[PDB]
Paper text:
[name] ([name], p27) is a member of the CIP/KIP family of CDK (cyclin dependent kinase) regulators that inhibit cell cycle CDKs. p27 phosphorylation by CDK1/2, signals its recruitment to the [name] (S-phase kinase associated protein 1 ([name])-cullin-[name]) E3 ubiquitin ligase complex for proteasomal degradation. Using cryo-EM, we provide an in-depth structural analysis of the quaternary architecture of the [name]-[name]-[name]-[name]-[name]-p27 complex which forms part of the [name] E3 ligase that controls p27 ubiquitin-mediated degradation.
The conserved LFG sequence sits in a deeper, more hydrophobic groove formed by [name] Ile213, Leu214, Trp217, Arg250, Leu253 and Gly251,, which also constitute van der Waals contacts with the p27 Leu-Phe pair. The final component of the p27-[name] interaction involves the p27 310 helix (residues 85–93), which binds through the catalytic cleft of [name] into the ATP binding site. Additionally, we were able to identify other key p27 residues; Phe87 sits deep in the active site cleft wedged by [name] residues Lys33, Leu134, Ala144 and Phe80, whilst p27 Arg90 hydrogen bonds with [name] Gln131.
Numbering used by the authors:
A (entry chain A): 14 to 297
B (entry chain C): 22 to 93
C (entry chain B): 175 to 432
C-alpha cells in the first residue's frame, strides 16, 4: 500500500532493480496461473528489447520478482510530448527497436497479446522494451493456443473481434501498426466503446472487408453481410505527416489478411528502415 | 455420488501426515540466503536490510504503472 | 508459422537438452521402482481422461516429476503427492480453465488434505528453478505433421498414441531426446497406415536420417506390439474412442525393413 514499490539502485556500478510484490492467498489453485505463465515465459527470453526478470523469490505467503528498472512508459511520455509531437527520428527509433523485440519473441515460440502503449517501457538511452508478459502464452505453432478474448479492446485485431479458434503472429503486428500510426498523430485511431462500434470504427478507414481483399471473411463466425458499404479512406488523410517511404509500411502492416500482414522479421528490411539512429528523449 | 469410479483410487496405502508436514515445512522455511544476502533484503517481512544495495521508497507517481499493477 | 518455423525448431532442439532428466536417475531411489512410476503415470492418464484435460498437460506433467525425482529425494508414501502437484502445475500452464485444488484432493480419495497438495507445488517450483516450459514429444510431432501430405487422416492420431505409450515405461525411453522419440513415432504410424518411410522433407530439415532412428524404432515397436498385454491399460482404452479415429484397434505391423 504505502511502500508499494522498493526501487533499489546499485552502488557497485550495477543496474537498477525494482520489486514487484504478489500476495498469495494460498487457499485455492495455489499460485495463480497469471504468475506461473509470466515467470516461465520471461526467463527463456533474453533480448536488449525485453525487460529482464533478474530474480524471482517465493516465500510462504508472498512472491517477489526483481525486475530491471525502466524510467518512463510510452503513454506518459507521449502525453507530455503531445504539444510538440514525437519527432520523426524518435518514432523511427522506437519502431526499429520494438519490431526487433517482437520478431525475437515470435522466433522464440512465445506470443505476446496486449501491446498497450502502457506496456512499452523506454529509458534515457533511447532503448525500448516489451514489459507485460502476463497474457503471453507459448504456441509452437499458432494452432495450439485457443481464444479467451482478454486483450484490450482498442488494440484487438479484426480477426479477434469476429471470433476465432486459434491465434496467430499477426495480432502483435496489428497492435504494433496501431501504435505506429497512433504516435504520428497523437490520437488513438480506433477508440471504440464496445466490440461492435470498434468494428464500425475499423471499417470506416480501411474499407468494408470484401471477399476480394479477405478470402476467408464470408464464412467467418460473427460476420454478417448486413454491413455498411463504407469506402476505403485515402491514407494521405489518415496520417498526414508521413514521408513517401512510410506510406507503404503502414498499409502493409495494417493489412486485413492474417496471412499477409508483414512479418516482424520482414518489416526490418522494408525500405522505410534505411537510416535509423537513436536519440535521447526529454529526460525519460 | 460415491466418488468417481476410475480416478478416485488410493495408490500407495497410508502415509504419515505429521512427518510429511514437518518435512514440507522445513524445506519451506529453508529457502533463504544466497538471495536474501545477494539482494541484501529481508524478504520475509518486506524489510530493506542494510547493505550495498540502496532500497528506497517510491511513490506511485513518477514511476511506470507496471510495478504496482494488481492482478486481474 | 512458416516464417519463424525454422527458428522455432532450432530453439526447440537446443532447449531439449537442458530440460532433460538424468539417465538412470531412479535406481538410486531406495523406495520406488519402475512398477510404481508406470502405475503413477497410468493414474495420471485416467485422471486426465476424467477431467477433459488437454493432451499437452500429461506430456508436461510426467516431465516435471522426471526433473524432480532426479534432484530431490522422495519417500514411497508421498509419491502420489508429487504426481498430484505435477498435474496441478502442468494444468495451470497449458489449460484454459485450471481445475481447482479441492477437485484434485477429491481425486486422490481424501488422503492428502488441501493444505497438503500445496506446500508440495511450493517445493516443485523451486527445484526446477521455475523452468516449466519444457519441450516434449507432443510439441515435436506437431511440427512434423504438416509434411505428411496436406490431407492424411489416421496418421496424426496413431502417432499421438505411440508418443503417449512412451511415458509409461522409463526403461529404455529415458535416453532418447524428445526429438528422436517423436521421429520414431511419426515414422511408425506412417508405415502402419500409409506405407511411405521417413519423409524426405523431414530428413533435410531435422537432420536425422532413417539410420539414426533405428534404435528408437526397435524400442518403439516392442511397446507397440505388447501394449495390449501391458499391466497398465488406460491409454489404449483412451484412444479406443472415435475422437482419435479409433486407431487403438488397428493391427500392429509385424516386421520392418529399416
Amino acid at each position: 500500500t504505502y511502500g508499494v514499490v522498493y526501487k533499489a539502485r546499485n552502488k557497485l556500478t550495477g543496474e537498477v532493480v525494482a520489486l514487484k510484490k504478489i500476495r498469495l492467498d494460498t487457499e485455492t489453485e495455489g499460485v495463480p496461473s497469471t504468475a506461473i505463465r509470466e515467470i516461465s515465459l520471461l526467463k527463456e527470453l533474453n533480448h536488449p528489447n525485453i525487460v529482464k526478470l533478474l530474480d524471482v523469490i517465493h516465500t510462504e505467503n508472498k512472491l517477489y520478482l526483481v525486475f530491471e528498472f525502466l524510467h518512463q512508459d510510452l503513454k506518459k511520455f507521449m502525453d507530455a510530448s503531445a504539444l510538440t509531437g514525437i519527432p520523426l527520428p524518435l518514432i523511427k527509433s522506437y519502431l526499429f527497436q520494438l519490431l526487433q523485440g517482437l520478431a525475437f519473441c515470435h522466433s522464440h515460440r512465445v506470443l505476446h497479446r496486449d501491446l498497450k502503449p502502457q506496456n512499452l517501457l523506454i529509458n534515457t538511452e533511447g532503448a525500448i522494451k516489451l514489459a507485460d508478459f502476463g497474457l503471453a502464452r507459448a504456441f509452437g505453432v499458432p494452432v495450439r493456443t485457443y481464444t479467451h478474448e482478454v486483450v484490450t479492446l482498442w488494440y484487438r485485431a479484426p480477426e479477434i473481434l469476429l471470433g476465432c479458434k486459434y491465434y496467430s503472429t499477426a495480432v502483435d503486428i496489428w497492435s504494433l501498426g496501431c501504435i505506429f500510426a497512433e504516435m504520428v498523430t497523437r490520437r488513438a485511431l480506433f477508440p471504440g466503446d464496445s466490440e461492435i462500434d470498434q468494428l464500425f470504427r475499423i471499417f470506416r478507414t480501411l474499407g468494408t472487408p470484401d471477399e476480394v481483399v479477405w478470402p476467408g471473411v464470408t464464412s467467418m463466425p460473427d460476420y454478417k453481410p448486413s454491413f455498411p458499404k463504407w469506402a476505403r479512406q485515402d491514407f494521405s488523410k489518415v496520417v498526414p505527416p508521413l514521408d513517401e517511404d512510410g506510406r507503404s509500411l503502414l498499409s502493409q502492416m495494417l493489412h486485413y489478411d492474417p496471412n499477409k500482414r508483414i512479418s516482424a522479421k520482414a518489416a526490418l528490411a522494408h525500405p522505410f528502415f534505411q537510416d535509423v539512429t537513436k536519440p535521447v528523449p526529454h529526460l525519460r | 455420488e460415491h466418488p468417481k469410479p476410475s480416478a478416485c483410487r488410493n495408490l500407495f496405502g497410508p502415509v504419515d501426515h505429521e512427518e510429511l508436514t514437518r518435512d514440507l515445512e522445513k524445506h519451506c522455511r529453508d529457502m533463504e540466503e544466497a538471495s536474501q544476502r545477494k539482494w541484501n533484503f529481508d524478504f520475509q517481512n518486506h524489510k530493506p536490510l542494510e547493505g550495498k544495495y540502496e532500497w528506497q521508497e517510491v511513490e506511485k507517481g513518477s514511476l511506470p504503472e507496471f510495478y504496482y499493477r494488481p492482478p486481474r | 508459422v512458416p516464417d519463424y518455423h525454422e527458428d522455432i525448431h532450432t530453439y526447440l532442439r537446443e532447449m531439449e537438452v537442458k530440460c532433460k532428466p538424468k539417465v538412470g536417475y531412479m535406481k538410486k531411489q531406495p523406495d520406488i521402482t519402475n512398477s510404481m512410476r508406470a502405475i503413477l503415470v497410468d493414474w495420471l492418464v485416467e485422471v486426465g481422461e476424467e477431467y477433459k484435460l488437454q493432451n499437452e498437460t500429461l506430456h508436461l506433467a510426467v516431465n516435471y516429476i522426471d526433473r524432480f525425482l532426479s534432484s530431490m529425494s522422495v519417500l514411497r508414501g508421498k509419491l502420489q503427492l508429487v504426481g498430484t502437484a505435477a498435474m496441478l502445475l502442468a494444468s495451470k500452464f497449458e489449460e484454459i480453465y485450471p481445475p481447482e485444488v479441492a477437485e484434485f484432493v477429491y481425486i486422490t480419495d481424501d488422503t492428502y488434505t488441501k493444505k497438503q497438495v500445496l506446500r508440495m507445488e511450493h517445493l516443485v517450483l523451486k527445484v526446477l528453478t521455475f523452468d516449466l516450459a519444457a519441450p516434449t514429444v507432443n510439441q515435436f510431432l506437431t511440427q512434423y505433421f504438416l509434411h505428411q501430405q496436406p490431407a492424411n487422416c489416421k496418421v496424426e492420431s496413431l502417432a499421438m498414441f505411440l508418443g503417449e505409450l512412451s511415458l509409461i515405461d522409463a526403461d529404455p525411453y529415458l535416453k532418447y531426446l524428445p526429438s528422436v522419440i517423436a521421429g520414431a513415432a511419426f515414422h511408425l504410424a506412417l508405415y502402419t497406415v500409409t506405407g511411405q518411410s521417413w519423409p524426405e522433407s523431414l530428413i533435410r530439415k531435422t537432420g536425422y536420417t532413417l539410420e539414426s532412428l533405428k534404435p528408437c524404432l526397435m524400442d518403439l515397436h516392442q511397446t507397440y506390439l505388447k501394449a495390449p498385454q501391458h499391466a497398465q491399460q488406460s491409454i489404449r482404452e483412451k484412444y479406443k474412442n472415435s475422437k482419435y479415429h479409433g486407431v487403438s484397434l488397428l493391427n500392429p505391423p509385424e516386421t520392418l525393413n529399416l
